[PDB]
Symmetry: C2
Subunit: 340 residues, 2 copies
């Protein structure tokens, strides 16, 4: 009768390794009046967690040494003394890489006692879909005929961005690692083109398919991908800035002269809006509209959601390492437990 936990053993140096994570046990905490006990079924693994393990200054305190790794979870209520929550109720929570956690109410019921595809609340109906929706529609502001480019195209956020872009009237050009993912983005995700960033002539290929330039670049990756994108940006382009995965493993900045002023020069001469956003901020007023649109778009067949499910909490570290290596196909989720 134990709460297993994956904790941060040490901060990664470059790419995370198994040694950076430790599996530990703890007595199941007891809900103390007005609280409830959540038991996890699904755990989301996402690229932004790499940043959360690092000491870099960020939007949140880094995960402490020997503290439980953080993350979104789909749980059911094991026991409740809240009691606006009944036992057996499924919930979207943020309880991290463990079996159990206490909660004073902050999640959202999803979708009750017997929901269909509850793991979807971690993907298309959850944070990655909402990230795409908010970033693309509010910052990108797609118009009919806009050219939209997004990297990590077959990943959770990117695939949502591309498909929402397509239904909003964009020409959609993906960027992804390897020909199989590029072919999947075109064949199944409805991308107009998808360019392999591993190709020796990656930048020329991108330029070739973006023959009318780029109006929206949804930024997930940074690094060499953004370097290929930048010269193709159109006047009045928009750049929703969501993540910079390519640099999360860096231990130093690139050599060579400082190009920071070149970025600023380009934003000016092309009149570009570049805007960062963090999806965990207070967008409560927007969840409902998002949920309504996405439910409709899924039903209309305009959204294809791919899930990558790994069994076992103890496999979360290797799965997470696998995710960062690009050995994932679609949104990565770990089933931590059999449901009750």
């Amino acid at each position: 009768p134990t709460n297993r936990q994956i904790v941060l053993a040490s901060r990664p140096v470059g790419a995370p390794t198994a040694d950076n994570f430790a599996l530990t046990q703890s007595d199941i905490p007891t809900p103390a009046q007005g609280e409830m006990l959540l038991r996890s079924v699904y755990l989301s693994l996402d690229p932004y967690m790499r940043g959360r393990m690092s000491d870099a200054k960020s939007y949140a305190e880094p995960v402490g040494i020997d503290e439980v790794m953080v993350g979104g979870t789909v749980c059911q209520v094991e026991a409740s003394n809240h009691a606006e929550f009944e036992v057996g109720e499924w919930v979207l929570a943020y309880t991290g890489w463990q079996d159990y956690a206490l909660s004073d109410g902050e999640g959202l019921i999803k979708l009750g006692k017997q929901p269909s595809h509850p793991s979807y609340a971690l993907g298309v109906m959850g944070m990655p879909g909402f990230t795409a929706y908010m970033g693309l529609l509010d910052i990108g502001q797609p118009k009919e005929g806009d050219t939209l480019v997004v990297a990590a195209a077959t990943g959770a956020v990117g695939s949502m961005v591309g498909q929402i872009g397509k239904l909003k009237g964009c020409r959609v050009i993906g960027i992804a690692g390897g020909e199989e993912k590029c072919q999947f983005a075109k064949d199944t995700l409805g991308f107009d083109e998808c360019i392999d960033h591993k190709a020796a002539d990656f930048a020329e290929q991108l330029a070739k398919v973006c023959h009318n330039g780029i109006d929206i670049y949804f930024e997930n990756v940074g690094g060499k991908v953004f370097d290929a994108v930048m010269p193709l940006l159109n006047t009045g382009a928009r750049i929703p800035l969501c993540g910079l995965i390519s640099q999360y493993n860096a231990t130093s900045l690139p050599e060579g002269p400082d190009r920071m002023s070149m970025l600023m020069a380009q934003l000016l001469i092309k009149r570009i809006k570049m805007q960062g956003f963090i999806i965990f901020d207070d967008y409560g007023h927007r969840y409902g509209e998002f949920a309504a649109d996405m439910t409709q778009w899924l039903a209309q067949g305009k959204i294809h959601y791919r899930e990558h499910l790994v069994q076992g909490l103890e496999n979360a570290p290797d799965a997470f390492i696998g995710l960062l290596e690009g050995k994932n196909f679609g949104k990565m989720v770990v089933q931590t437990n059999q449901p009750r």
Copy 2:
């Protein structure tokens, strides 16, 4: 004769007199549906430094032996348009010359006998409008926002700070040397103004920006932005209007590449950085701007300083003086006595 100041050679580093040549040409003839404009006032502005360089930009570089570009206040010497009558004052973009042809694209301002017509190059023109569009549409100031703007006593910067103040911002200027900083505070209504020549500039800025920076109106870039960047708040906004500090640069700064550090900061602080060029199509906004600024002027909330230099042939030296920061207020050159 139509005198012209032409680009003789592209500047290397700071412009010199040799980069400019004075030439003459026969006064052009308006050919039916056209008109002949005769300049009275010529605007001199920092962005012209960029127009002289070979750099890729929003506009084609000024050609060698071509007439220098710029906003002008002219009157109609002769018109066959003829929605324009002779003697009518106009805001145009005819550059550093006495005369030029026009098929109508300017705006009548303010008729045959306007008050302060040179103001259409300043508080009521491009610098005022630049400040207005950048600050209000991109900056979106709220009461209590801390606004920082460099080149604080320059034309755009002065307007940004004063519009910022009347929108409820705490306004911190940045300028070169103690006199401009004192003038910004005493005459332009800046709450503070920090000397960017000070060895502890960055700490001085941090000291007065004790609750951080919510809006940074970017005119300058370089060392100033380097001091600003760590002080930016979550949700900050950065209207990007110019980068004067690098207009003289012949190479990129040394040291490792910080492009990814800027991008990381824009993400973790959820910042909006947005370039804009004031010569784009904002025609639909001109009336609202003129109306708002007329009101703010009447309300005593806007102090406009003009620096008027006599003689077209002094435009090169005046402009060089402007870039050296030897200007006080908006630089205008009177090219001719009016008719």
